[model samples]
Each structure stands twice: as C-alpha cells, then as structure tokens.
Target: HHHHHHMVHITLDRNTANSWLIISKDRRQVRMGDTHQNVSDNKERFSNYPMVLGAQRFSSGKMYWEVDVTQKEAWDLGVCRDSVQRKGQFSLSPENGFWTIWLWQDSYEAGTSPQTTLHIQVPPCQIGIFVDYEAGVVSFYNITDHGSLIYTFSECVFAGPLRPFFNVGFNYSGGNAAPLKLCPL
Candidate 1:
C-alpha cells in the first residue's frame, strides 16, 4: 500500500517582499542589515522581498521543488544554509546578493560535503531551478526541457536531521544583474 501526502505551495510576487526583505538601492526595507562599509552593494543588490511559502514541521529527508523565473531576472536558486534567521524577515540593503533555499540543521555558512557536492555550469536564458533533499543534492535544469542537468551540488545537508527553518534568498553582487526570481510550484 502507498500513502499520499499534501505538499504546501506558495505563490510569489512583488507583494511577497512584504513578508521577506526586498533590498533595493533606495531603501532598507528588511531588517537583515543596512549599508555598512563592509558591504555597500548589499542595499542595492537585493530587493529583499522573497516569497516565503508554507512552513510545516519537517523531518530530515529528501524533498523536491522547482521555481519559475521565466519573466524575471538572473540569479541562483538553491537551498540556503539557514532559515531561522529569515523567519518572516527582510533586508533593505541594496548589495548584490543571491537567494538561498535549503534545509539546514545549523548555521547557513556550513559548506557542502565533497562527497555530496555536485556542480554544473548554468546555461543561458535560465531563470528557474529546483532541489531534491532525499537525494542530498541540488540540481539545476532547463526550465523548458527539464531533461538535461545544469548545475548539481552534493555537499553538507545544511546540518540536517534537524527541524531547522529554510527559505530562499537573492544574490545581486554582480552589478546590472537582476535579482533571482521565484514562483511557487
């Protein structure tokens, strides 16, 4: 016999920033931090607004997800090192940044384990990505074909076996680059 479960999905858009930080050059919309000498672009790089979906009680296991940025800009979409810090938060800094989406049992800085680390050069016209927790990997595929793999990483499990929080973050360090966009599945 097979059991079925319902997964939570959240739709993301401009208003989504109200829940998460959408950092821009003109405003310190979120609370992560402000433009300090250390990182000036932090304020202009990100919009700070992230569409945070459902937060359910999760256990350490494999999970799958795909994000659509077809109408958005360029950025990486993968698991973040930490989510507890971003629980309904925002950043106003405009520093270029990247979005982080992952399940972590510890801080978000823990690097991925080499055994589980995977890598692939991202292709052009790509604005979406996904994650597979059970596989202990993050795979980037063509949003259109969904056949070939773009980028893959098998590193640390974000310190898993933990009920830690997780969410998506945007990176805009590269000037003139659009922040990573994400839409629910």
Candidate 2:
C-alpha cells in the first residue's frame, strides 16, 4: 500500500470530514484538480479561473502551504471571485491573530464588488482548513504553533439553488527573486 503521510484530505459533509495536506519537495507548479471555472470580471483586468463551490460540487475546497524560498518582496494567496456582486460577502487573506485565510462571495451580481479584506504582516507558518456541514462553518488555522486558531468564517449562507463553482489559487510573488516553497502543514 502507498502511504501518504504528507498529504491531508478533507471533505465538506455532515457525517464525516476530511483534510488533505499537500507537500512540496521543491518549487514547482501544482494543480489541485478540475474543480475551478474561469470567469470574466469587469473590475479586474483578467479572467477568473476555474473554481469549486460548496453548493455546486461535493468536494469544493483545497489548500496548500509554501515558504518564501524565492525571497520575493510580496507573496499572494487568495481566491478570486472574478465578478463580485454587492449582495454577497467576500474576504481575502483574512487574519485572526497570527494566521491568514482567503475567501470571496457572490451575494450580489457579476459586476459589483463583494466585501473584501486583506491580511498584512503575517508571520511565516503552516495553514490548515476545516469545513464542516453540521456546524455550517469553514475555518482556517495556523499549524506552526500546534494548530493555533487563526481565522474563522461564519455567517455565510449556502442556501439551496444559490451555490456556484468557485476557483481557489495561491500565487507567490516578489521577495529576493527566489522561488517560494510550500510543504505539508
């Protein structure tokens, strides 16, 4: 049997939950799956890529972690909801204490801007995710300090017939011109 001690798998369901940890030995391009969709955003100058949504797909979330291997000045990790409507809530790189998480919503339309937030000056550490249906909550944690609570997301409603596929991605930019590395948290 193949043992995968470095990867954690998570599923957003009521009965059982799973988490997956993706480990990287070197800096390279890693694809989660065919779970995202590409959309066009008027506000932004680029098209939104493939995404996985809770109401749309059974498995709708994925996460990865990396370090500043390239030593760039600035690194980005977030989910782009190509078109943000005014009715839904959105958060990008939300912070609690010492950790950060990225999210976006579409409670509005295609051209409107959803509530967006960015986290700054966060220390380098491991990030973990927990999506539960019983509690109806999605959470992210900092694993650097024995799974310290970093960010918790609630109050978002996934009512029937309103769920759509949402894409998730993390981009590392800037630093000292070196490649960033993300290992299993």
Candidate 3:
C-alpha cells in the first residue's frame, strides 16, 4: 500500500486549460465548467476537449500519481508529450503524443491507435498511473481494488518531457459534472 518510493505530486496547469474546464485555486483539481465563459482561444488551450495538463513535467526516472474519479461519470487520464497539439480536433492516441485511459458510458478504454476496449469487471473509482521514462513504459491501475493493473503502454518514445494529462469528457449534461482531483501521495 505504500508507493512513496516513486510517488510524484502533480497539479493542474490552469494556463493550458480549455475554456470549459475549471481549474481549482489549489490547482490539484479540474472539472468541467457549468457554463462556458468568454475565454480567449489561446494556442495552448484545447478548443474542443475539456482538458488540462500538469504543472510539472517528467523527463526521466519513475513517476507515479493517483487520481480520484469516484464522483465523475466520465474521464480521461494519463500522460502526454509537452509538444502535443492543443488547438485542434486531435485523436487521443500515442501517435498523437497522448497515452491515456478513458472511462465513459460505463466502459473503460485505452487511448491507443484503433482504441482498445478494456474489459474491467469493476469500474475504477480511483486510478493510479505509473511511468518509467527510461524504460519507455506507462501503466494504469485501478487503485480502488488494491492496485489492479488496468492497462499499459510499452515502448513509448518521449521526444520531450511528459506531463500529466486529464479530461473530464465533454458531456456536461450527461452527469459528468464532478471534478477530477489529483490525490496527494
């Protein structure tokens, strides 16, 4: 139950948040905004997705973090290259510099080319992500169930530092109103 050895704390980077995403003052939580405000369409902002990146980036060594998604009905979590495009309708896949796992419509999916559907018996309320930069591996675990392995991205090549990436799916009315909170180690 102790992961102090590799734990890494991360906070949401409000500057890169989409207009419809609300980053908490503490910067550790992000949620889909109830109303869309007249925010500037910055080049680093996501135009269509309700997403945000972490304030810190990792270049090498092992890093681990957990997220609380118990109150959310849909969400996406993982890591992304610092240079990933943020202004267009981009695919959430490794080819596009994103390696993530998503939960939506009562299903869990890995963000891989030709998206992979994961058959998880229990929907994860808390997710743990672990990355070994030099090893080129990223793994997801269902922390609610004693850290069950959910998915992994192997042989990942990082051209630059990777940052924690998150998204509370674009279904504001579909009961996805909860904030995605970054858990403290």
Candidate 4:
C-alpha cells in the first residue's frame, strides 16, 4: 500500500532461475517444476538452489513489494544482494546477502546468521517486504495480519543492487506444490 512508499513492480528473472523452477509466462509467479528444465547456465542463474530472483534491482531508496503465498505449505521469500553467488546450496541467510524468512513444515525460521526460528502470531497469506537501502534495513510484514511485523534484518551491508528472492520449495508428492505469486502494488 501507499503506507510503505516506493512499491516496486517485481517480476521473476528468467535467467536467474534454476532448472527446477517454472516461471509463469507473465514472469510474476514461480513454482517448483516437475524436476528440471534444460536451460543454458549463466552467471545470474542458480545451479543448485531451487530459486529465482526479481527482474528489478534496487540500488538506493526505499522499495516495497508483496508476494502472495496464500496456498503454499512451504516457501522461502526475501531479498538478496545482486552480487550473491549464483551457484551452490546457499543457505540464503543475512550473513551472506540474502535477508530472508521461511515457512517450513516444522516452524517459521529467519534465514539469519543463527538460523533462528520465530513464533509469528499469525501466519501470513500475503507478505510485504520493505527495504530501506540507506538504513540497511529489510523488514517483512504480514499483510494478511494488518501490516504486522514478521522479521527485520538491520545493519545489513548492502554492496550492490538488491533483488527480490523467492523459493517455492520442494515439490513434494503429498503437498507443497503451490506457486508463489508477486502481487500488484
């Protein structure tokens, strides 16, 4: 909403996605595909992690965006420095470049240095990510819960541009195959 200010329109970066992801044609949604898709490897592409980044990169200023995880049973959504490594099983923590929070089958966890588990009062259906580049703050709000704060990464050392990050998680047979959608501002 306007309360956050500077909401950025985000889309999935096709070149940044790993082989296991299926990006929507509109480039605003992603889900774990069957297994893999044959695609050329590149510096921006993730080789091991099953994730994709936003096509937009923020350098300075406050930027906000929302991701709809209404039906997901598991997911990792956040923002990362543009220079983050594209290859390997990156834990996607604030210690590196990713400032993330995850919804696990077990509990809510922050992808922070210690990998802390948080007890959110209410689970979110839509998540709002607010970033203040100058303040080095990344705050996530539970939009489904009246803009309640979920977690924040403070004093982050941002180097270059920052990109929104999303992981649909593993495509389990029994469940957890829902797509993560980027919501309109």
lDDT of each: 0.33, 0.30, 0.87, 0.85
Off by over 4 Å in 1: 1-8, 11-58, 71-73, 83-128, 160-185
Residues 1-185, model 3: lDDT tens digits: 34447998798887789998888889988888778756777778877789899989899999999999986778889999999998868889998899999987788899998999997887788899999999999999888888888998999977889999999887646677888998888
Query: Judged by TM-score, which candidate is best?
Result: 3
Residue-by-residue lDDT tens digits, candidate 4, 1-185: 34467788888889989888889899988888886788877888888767888988898889998899987788888898888888766577766889999988858888986788887888889999999999999888889889988888899988889888888888665588889998987
Summarize candidate 2's per-residue lDDT along 60-143 as a digit string, tens digits.
Answer: 433332322122333233222223332223333222101123332311111112433434234434444444334444444545
TM-score between candidate 3 and the true structure: 0.94
Against the true structure, whose lDDT is highest?
3
Question: What is the lDDT for 181 in model 3?
Answer: 91
Give TM-scores for every candidate, taking all chains together and pairing residue i with residue i: 0.40, 0.37, 0.94, 0.93
Model 4 gets an lDDT of 0.85
Better of 2 and 4 by TM-score: 4
> Model 4 compared with the native: what TM-score?
0.93
